[PDB]
Design an enzyme around this catalytic site. Structure first.
Site: not given
Ligand SMILES: O=C([C@@H]1CCCC[C@H]1c1ccccc1)N1CCC(O)(Cn2cnc3ccccc3c2=O)CC1
Length: 330
Positions: A8, A13, A251, A268
Site C-alpha cells: 500500500n 485505490c 478500502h 488485502d
C-alpha cells in the site's frame, strides 16, 4: 496460499486489485513476459513496469511495490485515481501492452482474450429503414439500480428502447419516425470484464449499496444472436473486485480463485489469506462488488495455463535483478 501481495503505497485505490486480476490471467502474464523491452526506459516505459510487477509477484517473498508503474503512466495528482475508474486504468494498461506486442509472436493476445462483438441498431416503426452497426467491446458496464441479479442486467442491457414523439429519430430522408433502438451480442470474449454501476450522477456522485447478486456459473446463450453447439457461452467466476466505503473514502480488496478451481483467496493489499466461497461471492452482494471477471468454461485451461519460471526470458530476468542490485543502496 503461496501468493504474495502488493504494498500500500498511497491512494492507488483499485489499482492493486486490478493488478492481481491481470496477474492471474496467465495467458496475459506469459504474453507480457514475451514483450521486446530491452531497448526501453527503466521508469518511463509502461510495458516494462508491468513486467517488473508481474515478475516481482511471481518470485518475491516480500510484498511488491508499484511506484515505478504509476510513474510510467503518469497518474500522480492528489486525485487522479479517485476521479478515474477501473475500466480506464485497465485500458491504459492493456493498450500499452496491445501495441507493444506487435509484429511479435504474441501479437493480438489482448483482442484474443478481451475483445467481443456487438451489433447496435436503430429501426423505424411505420416507415421501413434500418441502421445496423458492428462495435468491438473490451468490457461491459451493467446497471444495478432496480436490478436484483446479473440476469436482469443482461436482460435490461439488450432491452429495446423506445424513441417516442418529442424524442423521435431523425431518419433524415424519412423525416421523424418513432423508433425502436437496441443492442445485441454476436460474441463474448474468453474473458468477461463486467463492471457494476454503483456510482451515479447529479440528481442533487453517489455510491449505490443496493443488494445485487451474481452466480459462480453464468450462462449467456440466450443473449447471443446465434448460439452454436459445441461451444456454449458458459462462464466461470474468476475474481470479485470489492470496495467498502462511500464517495469520500473506503478500502479496496479483491477475492480471487486463481486456478479457477473454486479455492478462493482474499487479497488485502499486502495480506493474502484463504477464504470461503461465501466470503467471496454471497458476502459481497450488499462491502460489495464493483467489477467481476468471468472466464469461459471452454477456455479455462488455456487462459489459466501453468506458468513456469523458465517462461520468463533470461534477458529480462538479468535486467530486473540488475535494477534490484542498484536499488539496494541506502
Ligand atoms: O473506486 C471507485 C470510486 C472512487 C471514488 C469514491 C467512490 C468509489 C466507488 C465507486 C463505485 C463503487 C465502489 C467504489 N470506483 C471504482 C469502480 C467504478 O469504476 C465502477 N464503475 C465503473 N464504470 C462505471 C460506468 C458508468 C457508471 C458507473 C460506473 C461505475 O460505478 C467506479 C469508481
Amino acid at each position: 496460499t503461496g501468493y504474495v501481495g502488493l504494498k500500500n503505497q498511497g491512494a492507488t485505490c483499485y489499482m492493486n486489485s486490478l493488478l492481481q486480476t491481470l496477474f492471474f490471467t496467465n495467458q496475459l502474464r506469459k504474453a507480457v513476459y514475451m514483450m521486446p523491452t530491452e531497448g526501453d526506459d527503466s521508469s518511463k516505459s509502461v510495458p516494462l513496469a508491468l513486467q517488473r510487477v508481474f515478475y516481482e509477484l511471481q518470485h518475491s517473498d516480500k510484498p511488491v511495490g508499484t511506484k515505478k508503474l504509476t510513474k510510467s503512466f503518469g497518474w500522480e495528482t492528489l486525485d487522479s485515481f479517485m476521479q478515474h475508474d477501473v475500466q480506464e486504468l485497465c485500458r491504459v494498461l492493456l493498450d500499452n501492452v496491445e501495441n507493444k506486442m506487435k509484429g511479435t509472436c504474441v501479437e493480438g493476445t489482448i483482442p484474443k482474450l478481451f475483445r467481443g462483438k456487438m451489433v447496435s441498431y436503430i429501426q423505424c416503426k411505420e416507415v421501413d429503414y434500418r441502421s445496423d452497426r458492428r462495435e468491438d467491446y473490451y468490457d461491459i458496464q451493467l446497471s444495478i439500480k432496480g436490478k436484483k441479479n446479473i440476469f436482469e442486467s443482461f436482460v435490461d442491457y439488450v432491452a429495446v428502447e423506445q424513441l417516442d414523439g418529442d424524442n423521435k429519430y431523425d431518419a433524415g430522408e424519412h423525416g421523424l419516425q418513432e423508433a425502436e433502438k437496441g443492442v445485441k451480442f454476436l460474441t463474448l470474449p474468453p474473458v468477461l470484464h463486467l463492471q457494476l454501476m454503483r456510482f451515479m450522477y447529479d440528481p442533487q456522485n453517489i455510491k449505490i449499496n443496493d443488494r445485487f447478486e451474481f452466480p459462480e456459473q453464468l450462462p449467456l446463450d440466450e443473449f447471443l444472436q446465434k448460439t452454436d453447439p459445441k461451444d456454449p457461452a458458459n462462464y466461470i467466476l474468476h475474481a470479485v473486485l470489492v470496495h467498502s466505503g462511500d464517495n469520500h473514502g473506503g478500502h479496496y480488496v479483491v477475492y480471487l480463485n486463481p486456478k479457477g478451481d473454486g479455492k478462493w483467496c482474499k487479497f488485502d493489499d499486502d495480506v493474502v489469506s484463504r477464504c470461503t466461497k461465501e466470503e467471496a461471492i454471497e458476502h459481497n452482494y450488499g462491502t460489495n462488488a464493483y467489477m467481476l471477471v468471468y472466464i469461459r468454461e471452454s477456455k479455462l485451461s488455456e487462459v489459466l495455463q501453468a506458468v513456469t519460471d523458465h517462461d520468463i526470458p533470461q534477458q529480462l530476468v538479468e535486467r530486473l535483478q540488475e535494477e534490484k542490485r542498484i536499488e539496494a543502496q541506502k
